[PDB]
Amino acid sequence: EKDFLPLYFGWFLTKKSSETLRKAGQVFLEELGNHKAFKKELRHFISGKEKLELVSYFGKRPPGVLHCTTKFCDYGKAAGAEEYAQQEVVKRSYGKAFKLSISALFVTPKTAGAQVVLTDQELQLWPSDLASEGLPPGSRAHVTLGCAADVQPVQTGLDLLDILQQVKGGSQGEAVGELPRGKLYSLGKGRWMLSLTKKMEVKAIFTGYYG
Numbered sequence: 001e002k003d004f005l006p007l008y009f010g011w012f013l014t015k016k017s018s019e020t021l022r023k024a025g026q027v028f029l030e031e032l033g034n035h036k037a038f039k040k041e042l043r044h045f046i047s048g049k050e051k052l053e054l055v056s057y058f059g060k061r062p063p064g065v066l067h068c069t070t071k072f073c074d075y076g077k078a079a080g081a082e083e084y085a086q087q088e089v090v091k092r093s094y095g096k097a098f099k100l101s102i103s104a105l106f107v108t109p110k111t112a113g114a115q116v117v118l119t120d121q122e123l124q125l126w127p128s129d130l131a132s133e134g135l136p137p138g139s140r141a142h143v144t145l146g147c148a149a150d151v152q153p154v155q156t157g158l159d160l161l162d163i164l165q166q167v168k169g170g171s172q173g174e175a176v177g178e179l180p181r182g183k184l185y186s187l188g189k190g191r192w193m194l195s196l197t198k199k200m201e202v203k204a205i206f207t208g209y210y211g
């Protein structure tokens with residue numbers, strides 16, 4: 001017969017790095033939800049002067065260890081899944097330890113996440129399958145921290161690219177606040193970005209999740 005692939009490949013953060021990044025994620029949501037600049041724009045965030053707690057809003061969280069997905073394969077069902085998995089670099093990198101650089105945390109009405117900036121060696125593990133929005137490959141790279149109730153997986157990546165495209169255009173604007181980890185930017189349409197002063201490094205293992 002034939003070997004079937006994972007549900008997806010990706011970098012899976014270590015227990016330690018997962019707990020650090022998860023904790024920073026919640027603090028950001030707590031800080032953002034309580035920031036005056038965010039409350040001003042709540043009507044651009046939800047359709048519903050009360051306060052919204054974003055930890056609650058992003059109720060659908062990764063339950064185990066956080067991860068940075070590369071190729072979603074659906075056991076080979078997804079286009080290009082087999083071609084991605086058959087690559088040498090993928091087979092060679094399987095079970096290898098990597099360090100991922102987090103450059104920012106972001107929030108939209110649909111998802112909450114951390115932006116990952118991949119190295120050139122890590123970029124070799126990015127699927128070529130990934131409308132381009134004139135951004136370099138790997139721009140979508142991220143760790144999901146939370147999702148709104150009716151949101152489906154893929155949306156976090158889309159949300160990030162939209163944001164990075166807005167930043168690209170220079171329409172990110174002056175910062176609207178300073179948080180302990182960096183500057184907060186209001187991109188409108190319920191979109192928010194914390195640019196980390198110091199990029200956060202997390203340890204991960206590249207491997208396949210079967211579920």
Ligand SMILES: Nc1ncnc2c1ncn2[C@@H]1O[C@H](CO)[C@@H](O)[C@H]1OP(=O)(O)O
Nearest residue numbers: 008069072143144152153154155156157
């Ligand atoms: N097209 C797709 N369908 C389902 N999951 C996808 C996907 N593309 C990427 N993924 C990722 O696969 C994992 C399981 O669904 C999720 O972490 C998701 O990343 P996400 O964090 O943006 O949701």
